Amino acid sequence: STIFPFIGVPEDYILPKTEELPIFREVAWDFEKDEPILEKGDFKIIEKKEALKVWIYKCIKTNRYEHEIY
Amino acid sequence: STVEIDFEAQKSYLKSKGVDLSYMTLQEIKEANTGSKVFLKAKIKVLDAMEDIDLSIEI
């Protein structure tokens, strides 16, 4: 809370972290039946590209101003 | 699109009237007198409005 990094950062000072997004994860969804998927009696979680596919499908399938919640 | 003289119809009409078609040539078949009757043909293709969308998404 003491340093003034706007002109330059002190040489001893270490940056706390680099800012990155966590691993994208989403509940798995099947497209031919339009349901969430149950695995061993529980919801199955996928990650990264498949989760992005699920999100993209849901985003394309909805209308813009139709729903009050969005 | 195309519009043309109907050759087969003229040939059939001339055959029915009884004219000998073997001796005459194709130009003479096209330009033969038919007696108040005209035969034509045409080709068109009719457009339709868009009502479905098929998206192929890559990754």
TrEMBL record, chain A:
Could you tell me the superkingdom of the organism this chain comes from?
Bacteria
- The protein's name in its UniProt record: DUF2634 domain-containing protein
Of the parent protein, the shown chain spans: 2 to 71 of 142
From TrEMBL, chain B:
Q: Which organism is it from?
A: Clostridioides difficile
Q: What is this protein called?
A: Phage tail sheath protein
Of the parent protein, the shown chain spans 296 to 354 of 354
Q: Which domain of life is it from?
A: Bacteria
In which family does this protein belong, per the annotation?
Belongs to the myoviridae tail sheath protein family.
